[PDB]
Symmetry: D2
Subunit: 498 residues, 4 copies
Amino acid sequence: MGMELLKHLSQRQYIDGEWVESANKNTRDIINPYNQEVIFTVSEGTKEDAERAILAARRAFESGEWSQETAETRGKKVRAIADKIKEHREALARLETLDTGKTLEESYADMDDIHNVFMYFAGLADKDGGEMIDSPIPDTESKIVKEPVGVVTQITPWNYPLLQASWKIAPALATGCSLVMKPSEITPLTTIRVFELMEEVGFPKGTINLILGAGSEVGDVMSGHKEVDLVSFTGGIETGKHIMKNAANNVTNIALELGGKNPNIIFDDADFELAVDQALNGGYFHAGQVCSAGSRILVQNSIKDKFEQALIDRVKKIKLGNGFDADTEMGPVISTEHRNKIESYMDVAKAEGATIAVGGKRPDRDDLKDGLFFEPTVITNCDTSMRIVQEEVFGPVVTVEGFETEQEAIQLANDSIYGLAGAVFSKDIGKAQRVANKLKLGTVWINDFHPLFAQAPWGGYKQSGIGRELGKEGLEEYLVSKHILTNTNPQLVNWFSK
Amino acid sequence: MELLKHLSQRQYIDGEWVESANKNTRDIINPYNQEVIFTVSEGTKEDAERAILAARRAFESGEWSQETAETRGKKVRAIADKIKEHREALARLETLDTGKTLEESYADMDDIHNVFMYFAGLADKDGGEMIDSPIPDTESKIVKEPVGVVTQITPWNYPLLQASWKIAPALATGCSLVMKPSEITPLTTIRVFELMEEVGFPKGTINLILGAGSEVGDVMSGHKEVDLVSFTGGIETGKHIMKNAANNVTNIALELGGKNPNIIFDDADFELAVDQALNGGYFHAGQVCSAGSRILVQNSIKDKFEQALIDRVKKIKLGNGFDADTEMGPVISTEHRNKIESYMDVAKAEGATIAVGGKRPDRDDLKDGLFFEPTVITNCDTSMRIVQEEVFGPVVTVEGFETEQEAIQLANDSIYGLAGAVFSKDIGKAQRVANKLKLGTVWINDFHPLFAQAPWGGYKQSGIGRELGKEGLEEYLVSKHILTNTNPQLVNWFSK
Amino acid sequence: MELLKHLSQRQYIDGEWVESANKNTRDIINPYNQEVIFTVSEGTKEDAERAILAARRAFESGEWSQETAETRGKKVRAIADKIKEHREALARLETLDTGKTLEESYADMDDIHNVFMYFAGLADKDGGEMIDSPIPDTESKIVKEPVGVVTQITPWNYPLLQASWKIAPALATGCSLVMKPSEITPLTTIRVFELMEEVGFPKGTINLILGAGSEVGDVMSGHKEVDLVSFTGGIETGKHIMKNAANNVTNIALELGGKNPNIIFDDADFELAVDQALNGGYFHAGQVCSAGSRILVQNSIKDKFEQALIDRVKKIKLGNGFDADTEMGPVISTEHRNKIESYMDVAKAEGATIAVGGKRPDRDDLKDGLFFEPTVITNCDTSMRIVQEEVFGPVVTVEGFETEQEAIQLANDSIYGLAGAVFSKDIGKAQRVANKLKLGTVWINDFHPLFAQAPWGGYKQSGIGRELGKEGLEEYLVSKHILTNTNPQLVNWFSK
Amino acid sequence: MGMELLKHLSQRQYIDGEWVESANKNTRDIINPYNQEVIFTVSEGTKEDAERAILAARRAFESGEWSQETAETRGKKVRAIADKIKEHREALARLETLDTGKTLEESYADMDDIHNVFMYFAGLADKDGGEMIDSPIPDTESKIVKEPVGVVTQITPWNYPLLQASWKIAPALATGCSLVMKPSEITPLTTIRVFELMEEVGFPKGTINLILGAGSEVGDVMSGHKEVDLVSFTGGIETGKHIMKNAANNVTNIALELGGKNPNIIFDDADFELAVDQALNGGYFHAGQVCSAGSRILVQNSIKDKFEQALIDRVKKIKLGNGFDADTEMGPVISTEHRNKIESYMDVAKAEGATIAVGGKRPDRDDLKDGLFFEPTVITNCDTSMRIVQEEVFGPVVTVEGFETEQEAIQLANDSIYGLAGAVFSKDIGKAQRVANKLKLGTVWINDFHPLFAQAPWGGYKQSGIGRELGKEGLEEYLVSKHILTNTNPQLVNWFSK
Ligand SMILES: NC(=O)c1ccc[n+]([C@@H]2O[C@H](COP(=O)([O-])OP(=O)(O)OC[C@H]3O[C@@H](n4cnc5c(N)ncnc54)[C@H](O)[C@@H]3O)[C@@H](O)[C@H]2O)c1
Ligand code: NA
Ligand code: NA
Ligand code: NA
């Protein structure tokens, strides 16, 4: 991309207008990846809690208190949430840094984007109730009414908790839906806080609900309950496929965003220093734990050697440390299990014949030994047939492959199971545009890397997802169309004998 | 709601008419007399895979996907004209294979011409949007591209009609497609492919597979090269398909029928309601996704309504679809007729009453066909299987309701949400009811109307997505956000 | 449906509060007692020209026109909040200057907040379109840009309300503007400018001219640097403006009032119709573009309706707008009251009957103000001037109609086409009538509703274009088609 | 960018379903500019004829036969017209060439575009009846119905008669309007023919009407009659202003397209031969009698001398002649009066201090002496303050001015009273895009000149017009919005005493 509060922060779930503990009183300790110290303890909900929230969401939806409220008034409420976000910008960002480990700077930028997401949707709320159709049948009035889709379950990941949450909550509330959200069990702090803020705004009982807990325990209820009309999920491909299959039991709509293997295509006529700078940004922000990370670098052969050296020299200078310290450029990874997964990819890489040009291990420096740190890494001498190139590592790691021609870059970039995002660096804009038109990706950046905003749809082709978040299209996931046809001059058909 | 001597018996793959890779065939039957009328290839899963790979290749070549939207529109329109041109033969073919009346079949052909024409005209009307970017010195745009390779599976009730709903938008947007009609009714689909071949499409753009869903079905829904799986049929096959599609996180569009309510208030135009109740339950022997199998009638007029409906149902004329006096043809197959017969047993076992019908007719000219008497089931309630489940036959149930609020609760008390009607002279009341029914389409004082200009699809278990209308075309498109930074500067986040 | 001691008395040009170039002033009056309440600058045509030139300069500088749509939205929203924040004072100010009741004024402020908020939210929602080009190797796009420099002229009936309708979209799209409220009611407009200054806009983006339309009006409509002239007022001034605008082929948006029919069928809710007939004719002493001055009542109930309406009109409470018991305030000025009085003479001379009212009230507390009695004119027809012309006072005419078809012909028999209502419990009939009325807005069983989410404007002589809604914003945008040939080749048409 | 059809072509007006002569039997001889010979004679209508057509249009609109027909069926009729155009492509093109003088190749292309304009609109007909609004007032239904604007008058010019006619007729018929059209008095042949074709398709009596005659006699009736809802005109600025002032008498909607002073901006990094080629195309197709002609060439100083010499050398080779001869590259101007207007501009140019680098006179070659020919011309050493640069000559003439920087090109290009179209020639696409974004023009071409099609709106900023033709926006000129608000739970306000 780009503490006082814990003593007052709620430790519970929010169900049917009440802050409640888990039905079995279980809890979970939340950790700070910088030092692996327990920073807070929260309720660990049960599947019956999730079910009660879903039933409450349904009841609240049928009561019409929110679903039948005027679109304009719903817009005002979503805007009020937007303002509470900005008002508590400092605390929310610190809280997100404490829980996820990324730098405060990155966190401030997230809060800025979150305010804008809510504000964008607040404004879109009353802008489109459907259409009037010119009917082909005389004496009939035809219209398409857009209604809230209904009860929606929302599941978010640990990399950008509040950000991913806003992308779902904003349109759900703007359209009039009822929702049940469950953040990642290892990072629920800002989500808990946003619910407290939403409660201050005021929503009819049951409209919004927060479940806390392991996906392995409550996850299936949220994706397969018959009272759910839409399941929206952002996370890994395996969990996504599972969710979809479970959702199929009730033919429930699904919206998924599953990360990718994002190419960063650098041509020999690119602005060289810019490309190096953006290659670093693409691979190492949030220790590369970004759905849109540019893990797969494609560089034109004529400048590959020059590029590799320049990138490697820079990677050695990346400053690791605590997210609260101003000099920090890269924080730690999210957990022990994720760090181990990354370490295993290093083994797979070497076993396949690739070269760990730099990094590929844990840093030894004293202030970093207690945290979940992993050195920024560059993997060279690799090709498309390797797992390290085809699979999403989701860590501070990037691979470099060379390409000869424009056509080869395109084939290589498109040679993956994914299709989320990517970039093309070239001073020849005409060439960049031809390439962008041929990349099978939801978002293509020309001479930039990471830009994304509420005004435009985000999502993936192929295995990177189904549907879109953000933009008008993102709002549409939360609506359903109904065709009401009125025959103004009804006559008997008299087909059947009388 | 003859040509056989010249009709192809093969599959159409990568620009060529070919037999199954294993030379297997299948006899096609006419439900009026259960006689074999034609024999066609019974494809293999390797044939389906070859068609998908050809679709992918044709899509990457850009011959169709990069053709101008306007020129694609002209081709879709040419198909529209060939449909109208061969209207007679197509309708006879559809009647011979499905058993519905010829009149119903002509109406289908008229709608099919209009579906293609509609999409032909929409083709060049929307390439995307220009976005006002929140980041200075950037240009933001959303380009709408053909979704890619698409697989299309259709049912046996309205084969060509359901096929047009998928083929038209797929071709209008620039996609490549592989279609597979119901194994028991592929005649008109084979014919439409022959017509499309006359129009002329780049090799691999269009492909036709013939065969059992149980043999080639899984490849069409789970192959990695497919970007969208569009299916119309039953709920069980639909759920299976969706699960299979999830293996590659493939988009799915599904339309699965329903338990459509026909709500009749005491202030409805009485004769109109009886007439439309018949139309809702018995067209195509009730083998319609939109059939009004579930009748909800206000208590004050339930007795008057039941008697009037029952008396009419006894007069329904059954017979051959080619005979002009025929009002209702036979059901589609032995298995489907048996399923219906079993529902009659379930109904009685649950305590419902078979007011009329509920059996096979024994009139000489009907004994050789797959006929089943139009039926009315009374004294039932929402807890019964006969009311909750889609029988998809010439059968309807009747339940009473006291108030406006009860009609709504009862109508919405099912797992489905496809379509329904409200009959009342009080339009204001009809509109309040329509706004509360969880259905994709609601008719006020009518039953069955549907057209290319408006989206058709279901809430809840009746489907995912929509067919027809602009929204139907959108299933065939995919959005791409291209963001250009016009004044690129180094971020300088990482040390140098 | 106090602050004066701190309120500015000057014009706002190019980021500065300034006096008229000739130091001339104008006394503003309170129509309740005709006392001078304030004095403001009376600008010159050179002042207007300087404001237009400053608007152009600011537009070319790009400080506002190239700002992100999102940030522009935030600014428009901040204005919306200042409106709500100063709701009490703005409403009192509007009542003091225009004479309408304080309750009517609070409602205006609530609508004004919503107009701005609406537009604030629409700001970043549509930058244009991507077109699927019919020419291979080309990219086609339509970019929506701010139309440019805009002049805005508002009337005296609802000054701030009419001002918001123009200012909001102009600022949301990135335009520069020069506004001039009615010379007799500029108080809330001056206040809104003070509030906009607090929000902060680049120098020259917003400008306020004060003065007689006869002196500065022509400059605002015929200057070559203006891209759009938006006006709300009377038909004669409107036509003049349009002709003047034609000198530079400048876009015009006009809203000119009307002769709004209020159609009441014999199956309408009788007490509701009487109630709405009163509301339609007498809010703001009928000085509303949307006033229902022309009542069309079905013959069968005409006598019953006339007596019921007349009896009510006699009970209408006139008085000071600040007094809670007031139902109707005074008319706006001497000249306007005189224009109304002259219509009474024309009415009688034509053969119509002044059933009630038609004069100034004598009661002591009303003698010092510009009061005029609510009036009902009967026994008239479509050929009369009193029926064809907009009186714009607390006056209504009553005509009878026999059938649905006659109501439609009579309603449409005028040079206007702004708004109207149909009162009938038979909604189906109300809808048929609404579809045939040549009016920009048609209410079914209501009178006056209007809101930012929907376009407002007139057919025929009631105007050109629309205000409010997406369409209202579009008056402030201009389309540019940018076509890039990605594979340029020489045509070689001309010899080498 | 018809010897024997004349024997069967109608010579009359088409009013209220009948081919009729002028009420006063007056006629007009139509001329072929190649040799100035009379080729045909047609009725010269009266103002009472125009009024009768307008009243018939109104009557037909109120009857609902066309305005209440299904949008789909209206689409089919417009499509039928499209097919008749293609069917009679050969004869129409010959007819257009015979009447206007442009080459037969240019005419075939027009017919191809005309088929596409009708087809485009045929397809758009049933695609948008309005919208459903989410009302801020509870218990109300809000909808916007898009209806045909009503009775429309349409006036076209002599340069591309059928083409300009299609742009108006197509959307008018697709939306359900009634229309009265009047082509240029000196070129009515293809318009008469299209009416004959429309009659074969079949439209309710009065829906379509054709008036023939001088603008000075029937023009005012068509722009100031009270029964007209829209006046659509394409032509010169002076007539346009007159029309608008007349339309104001009834506050009638106006759509105007008035030509321009279109810049053709050529940077030093443009593809040089391409720019020379397109500069020729921009200034000399149809003898430069095109609203979109690139009469004003802006060339970067560094290459001005090279460009001028290269353009001049080419202009001398332009082949003038009969439009029916395949070797013809440029035909004659439209009439004596127009040729004279051009000649006068040459005088003005020299008097102002400009140089007639080449051309600037009538050609003497034997086969051209009998026609209305005028040599392709290049005017150099001029500036923005001159009339020859500020005014639309509308002939085979172009001026050349130099610019130093990107910013100067923009200021110069924008320094006119017009704003219709223009081009930017540069291999640096990024620069071309910056320029395009700043030109106050309705259409900007990057590395091309003239492209225009039904799918995109065409029209001008400033004095080049009001409104748009083509595209969805062009169709919208033919629609009017109506907000129908239904209160579903009406209550008495009780404001007034009881
Ligand atoms: N929505 C509708 O319009 C519709 C249509 C037909 C049947 N139905 C319902 O379904 C029941 C009977 O239908 P049916 O079973 O004959 O048809 P079905 O539901 O299986 O649909 C038929 C289509 O699906 C294909 N198919 C079968 N297995 C497949 C697989 N594993 N993968 C992919 N495709 C596969 C078939 O070859 C055929 O093309 C009825 O009880 C009725 O309620 C609904
Ligand atoms: Na005043
Ligand atoms: Na008008
Ligand atoms: Na001529």
